[PDB]
Amino acid sequence: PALTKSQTDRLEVLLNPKDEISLNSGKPFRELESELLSRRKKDLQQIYAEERENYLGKLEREITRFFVDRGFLEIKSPILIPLEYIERMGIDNLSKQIFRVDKNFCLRPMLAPNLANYLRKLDRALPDPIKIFEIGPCYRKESDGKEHLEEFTMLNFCQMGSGCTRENLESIITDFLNHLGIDFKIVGDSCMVFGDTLDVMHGDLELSSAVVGPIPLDREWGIDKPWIGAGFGLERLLKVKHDFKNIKRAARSGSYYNGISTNL
Amino acid sequence: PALTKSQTDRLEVLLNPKDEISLNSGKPFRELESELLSRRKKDLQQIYAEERENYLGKLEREITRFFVDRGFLEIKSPILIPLEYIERMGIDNLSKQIFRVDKNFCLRPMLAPNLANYLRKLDRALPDPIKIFEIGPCYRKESDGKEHLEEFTMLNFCQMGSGCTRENLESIITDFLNHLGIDFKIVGDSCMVFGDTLDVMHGDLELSSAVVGPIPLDREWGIDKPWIGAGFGLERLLKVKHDFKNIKRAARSGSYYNGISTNL
Numbered sequence: 001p002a003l004t005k006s007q008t009d010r011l012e013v014l015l016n017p018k019d020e021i022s023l024n025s026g027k028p029f030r031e032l033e034s035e036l037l038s039r040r041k042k043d044l045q046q047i048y049a050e051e052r053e054n055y056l057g058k059l060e061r062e063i064t065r066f067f068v069d070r071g072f073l074e075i076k077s078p079i080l081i082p083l084e085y086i087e088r089m090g091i092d093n094l095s096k097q098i099f100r101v102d103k104n105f106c107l108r109p110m111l112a113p114n115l116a117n118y119l120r121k122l123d124r125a126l127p128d129p130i131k132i133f134e135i136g137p138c139y140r141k142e143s144d145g146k147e148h149l150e151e152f153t154m155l156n157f158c159q160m161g162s163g164c165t166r167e168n169l170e171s172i173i174t175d176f177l178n179h180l181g182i183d184f185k186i187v188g189d190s191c192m193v194f195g196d197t198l199d200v201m202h203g204d205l206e207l208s209s210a211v212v213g214p215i216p217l218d219r220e221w222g223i224d225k226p227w228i229g230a231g232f233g234l235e236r237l238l239k240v241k242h243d244f245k246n247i248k249r250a251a252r253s254g255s256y257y258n259g260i261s262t263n264l
Numbered sequence: 265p266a267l268t269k270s271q272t273d274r275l276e277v278l279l280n281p282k283d284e285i286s287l288n289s290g291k292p293f294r295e296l297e298s299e300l301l302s303r304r305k306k307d308l309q310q311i312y313a314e315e316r317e318n319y320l321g322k323l324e325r326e327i328t329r330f331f332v333d334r335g336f337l338e339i340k341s342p343i344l345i346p347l348e349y350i351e352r353m354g355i356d357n358l359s360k361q362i363f364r365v366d367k368n369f370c371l372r373p374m375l376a377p378n379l380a381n382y383l384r385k386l387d388r389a390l391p392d393p394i395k396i397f398e399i400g401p402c403y404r405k406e407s408d409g410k411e412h413l414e415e416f417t418m419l420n421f422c423q424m425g426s427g428c429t430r431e432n433l434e435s436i437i438t439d440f441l442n443h444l445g446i447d448f449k450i451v452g453d454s455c456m457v458f459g460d461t462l463d464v465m466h467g468d469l470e471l472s473s474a475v476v477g478p479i480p481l482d483r484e485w486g487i488d489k490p491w492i493g494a495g496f497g498l499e500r501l502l503k504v505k506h507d508f509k510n511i512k513r514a515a516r517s518g519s520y521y522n523g524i525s526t527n528l
């Protein structure tokens with residue numbers, strides 16, 4: 001009844017959180033693999049027959065509706081951005097985590113720079129307060145492990161003008177995570193782009209970093225009003241919602257569809 | 265009444281297709297600029313007050329519903345892909361249009377490789393026929409002009425197994441563009457990745473290239489069944505729908521929101 005590392009890895013790929021199957025049950029590999037293969041095929045067949053929606057896409061749509069309905073403008077900004085945005089976010093040569101493209105471009109590691117540009121520009125046209133959000137891919141070179149991806153999906157919402165207080169920021173975070181049914185706490189932390197943050201924690205998992213401005217970086221971006229904002233990783237939200245052991249189950253991938261192995 | 269090139273460019277930025285304003289009317293720049301600025305601020309204020317949805321995001325959601333409701337599985341696959349996928353799509357060192365990332369990766373220039381992988385894998389689990397689609401960013405270095413972007417958004421749908429005929433492919437294209445209200449014709453063309461294509465044309469604008477397999481490239485991807493597929497550019501669909509002069513009005517950008525200049 002002794003399984004090799006390769007056999008255990010194959011079974012872990014096929015195991016899903018809802019299964020009440022122990023790989024250490026004492027059953028031989030052939031029977032555990034056959035059982036899990038049958039369950040996962042059934043799971044994919046049910047998805048194909050009924051809903052057909054991708055978890056990341058569906059969560060993006062649900063989040064989009066939530067923020068649009070609360071008065072935030074939906075932004076879709078470039079993923080491929082000037083490398084100069086990095087230096088100007090105060091990221092001195094995190095900078096090592098940047099995927100570079102050609103000589104003067106990079107894949108955005110966060111949504112903040114593009115959203116700062118939109119806050120500044122929209123403040124010339126829209127009534128106070130300015131409320132915007134974006135959901136989309138971001139990129140960082142990571143270690144990684146069970147909680148970091150190199151290609152992940154960020155939500156960042158922000159507001160500039162009136163109402164940009166710690167209590168309003170916390171209230172939006174609370175309403176949002178209550179909508180998703182996710183328990184959390186808020187702890188204070190610091191990072192080097194923004195200074196002090198409010199970190200939104202689910203256990204020992206960071207779901208979001210949030211900031212109450214103004215901060216001295218604002219001048220580099222032409223921001224000259226109070227502001228609040230928060231960034232959330234969608235794959236981390238999915239990891240919590242579906243109780244995935246590893247965040248890769250939630251990622252853009254050819255190896256899992258809605259957390260189900262595609263190697264069947 | 266003579267406007268400089270810089271003045272005309274500024275007015276063209278602020279002009280929208282619905283305006284019945286001629287820059288050559290004889291009015292001075294100051295009055296044309298003031299009028300257009302007021303119209304565009306009004307337009308953005310109305311968007312902010314009412315719908316708040318981004319054109320690219322909203323079109324993606326509408327397309328997603330169309331294909332999900334017709335039995336296609338929604339895919340979200342990596343944007344950052346192995347450079348090896350390029351060579352294996354038969355793209356010999358289009359290859360010059362690839363944005364390279366590090367030494368062994370690139371930004372995907374098309375959705376086909378990831379979708380071929382999903383067709384192959386899903387054929388081991390799902391009943392015939394296999395029907396899938398993806399919408400998302402793709403990247404090519406272009407010239408460019410009024411119809412090409414370096415960062416654009418592709419829809420690619422495909423089917424493998426039964427029903428993979430020219431007539432079914434045309435029927436899906438027809439139902440899809442009828443749903444969007446876009447007139448078109450089909451013309452034969454060729455490309456070097458897929459061979460003969462059916463090009464979906466709106467006037468002299470190519471909306472899609474479509475392929476009826478099998479093709480000899482299939483073996484490199486483990487595809488061994490009949491298949492059909494088509495790829496559409498969402499920004500080109502928006503250019504037609506909103507009568508934009510230049511495709512940049514439709515792109516991910518900090519310079520236009522739903523075709524309205526953000527420089528106000």
Ligand SMILES: Nc1ncnc2c1ncn2[C@@H]1O[C@H](COP(=O)(O)OP(=O)(O)OP(=O)(O)O)[C@@H](O)[C@H]1O
Nearest residue numbers: 140142147148149152206207208209231232233236
């Ligand atoms: N590599 C990554 N993979 C997946 N999600 C991420 C990654 N980096 C950040 N996120 C998500 O984006 C949110 C805001 O990003 P932020 O810039 O605060 O990241 P972070 O503080 O470096 O995260 P961590 O401390 O876990 O590395 C995070 O709270 C997390 O949900």
Ligand SMILES: Nc1ncnc2c1ncn2[C@@H]1O[C@H](COP(=O)(O)OP(=O)(O)OP(=O)(O)O)[C@@H](O)[C@H]1O
Nearest residue numbers: 404406411412413416470471472473495496497500
């Ligand atoms: N650079 C681009 N910018 C915007 N849309 C594009 C671009 N390249 C391709 N598309 C869209 O993707 C669809 C399928 O792409 P395909 O690989 O057939 O491109 P293509 O034939 O090179 O386009 P074109 O002939 O106009 O350069 C095209 O019909 C078009 O709608």
Ligand SMILES: N[C@@H](CCCCNC(=O)OCc1ccccc1Cl)C(=O)O
Nearest residue numbers: 110112115116158209223227229230231
């Ligand atoms: N993941 C991010 C943390 C996200 C916190 C929210 N940030 C935001 O809403 O930015 C908009 C903004 C507005 C005004 C001035 C400047 C700026 Cl950036 C990080 O890397 O710390």
Ligand SMILES: N[C@@H](CCCCNC(=O)OCc1ccccc1Cl)C(=O)O
Nearest residue numbers: 374376379380422473487491493494495
């Ligand atoms: N824009 C693209 C044209 C898109 C046409 C549709 N292609 C497709 O559905 O691929 C799936 C697929 C299935 C099976 C075997 C191989 C493959 Cl690729 C280009 O660059 O010509």
Ligand SMILES: [K+]
Nearest residue numbers: 016017018019
């Ligand atoms: K389990």
Ligand SMILES: [K+]
Nearest residue numbers: 151251252342
């Ligand atoms: K990924």
Ligand SMILES: [K+]
Nearest residue numbers: 280281282283
């Ligand atoms: K016009």
Ligand SMILES: [K+]
Nearest residue numbers: 078415515516
């Ligand atoms: K773009």
Ligand SMILES: [Mg+2]
Nearest residue numbers: 094140142148
């Ligand atoms: Mg980090």
Ligand SMILES: [Mg+2]
Nearest residue numbers: 191199206209
């Ligand atoms: Mg952190």
Ligand SMILES: [Mg+2]
Nearest residue numbers: 191206208209
């Ligand atoms: Mg953080």
Ligand SMILES: [Mg+2]
Nearest residue numbers: 358404406412
């Ligand atoms: Mg081309």
Ligand SMILES: [Mg+2]
Nearest residue numbers: 455463470473
């Ligand atoms: Mg062409």
Ligand SMILES: [Mg+2]
Nearest residue numbers: 455470472473
């Ligand atoms: Mg083509």
